[PDB]
mmCIF file of all heavy atoms in Angstrom:
data_model
loop_
_atom_site.group_PDB
_atom_site.id
_atom_site.type_symbol
_atom_site.label_atom_id
_atom_site.label_comp_id
_atom_site.label_asym_id
_atom_site.label_seq_id
_atom_site.Cartn_x
_atom_site.Cartn_y
_atom_site.Cartn_z
ATOM 1 N N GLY I 11 101.913 76.289 108.107
ATOM 2 C CA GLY I 11 101.395 76.271 109.463
ATOM 3 C C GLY I 11 99.910 76.583 109.528
ATOM 4 O O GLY I 11 99.158 75.938 110.265
ATOM 5 N N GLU I 30 95.094 85.656 104.020
ATOM 6 C CA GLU I 30 96.392 85.596 103.358
ATOM 7 C C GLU I 30 96.683 86.917 102.675
ATOM 8 O O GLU I 30 95.843 87.425 101.928
ATOM 9 C CB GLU I 30 96.421 84.444 102.339
ATOM 10 C CG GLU I 30 97.571 84.503 101.378
ATOM 11 C CD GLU I 30 98.917 84.522 102.069
ATOM 12 O OE1 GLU I 30 99.065 83.908 103.139
ATOM 13 O OE2 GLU I 30 99.826 85.164 101.532
ATOM 14 N N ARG I 38 106.662 80.174 102.697
ATOM 15 C CA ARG I 38 108.054 79.844 102.437
ATOM 16 C C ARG I 38 108.215 78.488 101.757
ATOM 17 O O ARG I 38 109.340 78.026 101.591
ATOM 18 C CB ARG I 38 108.856 79.900 103.744
ATOM 19 C CG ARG I 38 109.296 81.315 104.115
ATOM 20 C CD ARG I 38 109.858 81.399 105.535
ATOM 21 N NE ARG I 38 108.807 81.549 106.531
ATOM 22 C CZ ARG I 38 108.997 81.471 107.841
ATOM 23 N NH1 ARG I 38 110.193 81.228 108.355
ATOM 24 N NH2 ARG I 38 107.958 81.641 108.659
ATOM 25 N N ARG I 59 113.806 70.083 100.913
ATOM 26 C CA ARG I 59 114.259 68.751 101.284
ATOM 27 C C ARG I 59 113.722 68.362 102.656
ATOM 28 O O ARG I 59 113.649 69.188 103.567
ATOM 29 C CB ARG I 59 115.790 68.681 101.292
ATOM 30 C CG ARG I 59 116.439 69.701 102.203
ATOM 31 C CD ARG I 59 117.937 69.759 101.954
ATOM 32 N NE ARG I 59 118.586 70.819 102.714
ATOM 33 C CZ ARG I 59 119.854 71.168 102.558
ATOM 34 N NH1 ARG I 59 120.631 70.566 101.669
ATOM 35 N NH2 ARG I 59 120.357 72.141 103.316
ATOM 36 N N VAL I 264 97.022 91.575 106.893
ATOM 37 C CA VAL I 264 96.579 91.896 108.243
ATOM 38 C C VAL I 264 97.340 93.117 108.733
ATOM 39 O O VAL I 264 98.573 93.177 108.632
ATOM 40 C CB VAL I 264 96.789 90.699 109.184
ATOM 41 C CG1 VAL I 264 96.504 91.106 110.629
ATOM 42 C CG2 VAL I 264 95.921 89.531 108.766
ATOM 43 N N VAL I 490 109.711 72.662 108.038
ATOM 44 C CA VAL I 490 108.255 72.565 107.941
ATOM 45 C C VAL I 490 107.676 71.978 109.220
ATOM 46 O O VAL I 490 106.653 72.455 109.724
ATOM 47 C CB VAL I 490 107.857 71.733 106.708
ATOM 48 C CG1 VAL I 490 106.404 71.289 106.787
ATOM 49 C CG2 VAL I 490 108.107 72.548 105.441
HETATM 50 C C1 LIG R 602 115.479 79.462 102.199
HETATM 51 C C2 LIG R 602 114.676 78.507 103.045
HETATM 52 C C3 LIG R 602 114.898 77.158 102.948
HETATM 53 C C4 LIG R 602 114.170 76.258 103.705
HETATM 54 C C5 LIG R 602 113.193 76.715 104.597
HETATM 55 C C6 LIG R 602 112.955 78.086 104.698
HETATM 56 C C7 LIG R 602 113.664 78.988 103.945
HETATM 57 C C8 LIG R 602 113.394 80.464 104.076
HETATM 58 N N1 LIG R 602 112.491 75.761 105.386
HETATM 59 C C9 LIG R 602 111.602 76.212 106.483
HETATM 60 C C10 LIG R 602 110.145 76.249 106.031
HETATM 61 O O1 LIG R 602 110.089 76.769 104.714
HETATM 62 C C11 LIG R 602 109.370 77.141 106.994
HETATM 63 O O2 LIG R 602 109.761 76.845 108.350
HETATM 64 C C12 LIG R 602 107.852 77.007 106.912
HETATM 65 O O3 LIG R 602 107.441 76.967 105.551
HETATM 66 C C13 LIG R 602 107.160 78.165 107.595
HETATM 67 O O4 LIG R 602 105.719 78.025 107.533
HETATM 68 P P1 LIG R 602 104.822 79.044 108.376
HETATM 69 O O5 LIG R 602 103.386 78.757 108.094
HETATM 70 O O6 LIG R 602 105.342 79.001 109.773
HETATM 71 O O7 LIG R 602 105.213 80.459 107.736
HETATM 72 P P2 LIG R 602 105.158 81.066 106.251
HETATM 73 O O8 LIG R 602 106.000 82.300 106.221
HETATM 74 O O9 LIG R 602 105.478 79.992 105.262
HETATM 75 O O10 LIG R 602 103.628 81.466 106.073
HETATM 76 C C14 LIG R 602 103.136 82.712 106.620
HETATM 77 C C15 LIG R 602 102.064 83.248 105.699
HETATM 78 O O11 LIG R 602 101.600 84.539 106.178
HETATM 79 C C16 LIG R 602 101.485 85.435 105.089
HETATM 80 N N2 LIG R 602 101.564 86.773 105.604
HETATM 81 C C17 LIG R 602 102.688 87.503 105.897
HETATM 82 N N3 LIG R 602 102.397 88.698 106.363
HETATM 83 C C18 LIG R 602 101.010 88.750 106.375
HETATM 84 C C19 LIG R 602 100.101 89.752 106.761
HETATM 85 N N4 LIG R 602 100.462 90.942 107.238
HETATM 86 N N5 LIG R 602 98.783 89.470 106.638
HETATM 87 C C20 LIG R 602 98.426 88.270 106.161
HETATM 88 N N6 LIG R 602 99.193 87.254 105.770
HETATM 89 C C21 LIG R 602 100.489 87.564 105.908
HETATM 90 C C22 LIG R 602 102.617 85.013 104.162
HETATM 91 O O12 LIG R 602 102.444 85.507 102.853
HETATM 92 C C23 LIG R 602 102.510 83.486 104.249
HETATM 93 O O13 LIG R 602 101.534 82.990 103.343
HETATM 94 C C24 LIG R 602 112.607 74.408 105.109
HETATM 95 N N7 LIG R 602 111.790 73.493 105.722
HETATM 96 C C25 LIG R 602 111.864 72.151 105.447
HETATM 97 O O14 LIG R 602 111.127 71.354 106.009
HETATM 98 N N8 LIG R 602 112.799 71.762 104.519
HETATM 99 C C26 LIG R 602 113.662 72.626 103.861
HETATM 100 O O15 LIG R 602 114.459 72.182 103.029
HETATM 101 C C27 LIG R 602 113.566 73.982 104.178
HETATM 102 N N9 LIG R 602 114.378 74.900 103.584
#
Side-chain angles (χ1 to χ4, degrees):
Chain I
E30 166 57 33
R38 277 169 276 171
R59 57 191 174 188
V264 172
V490 164

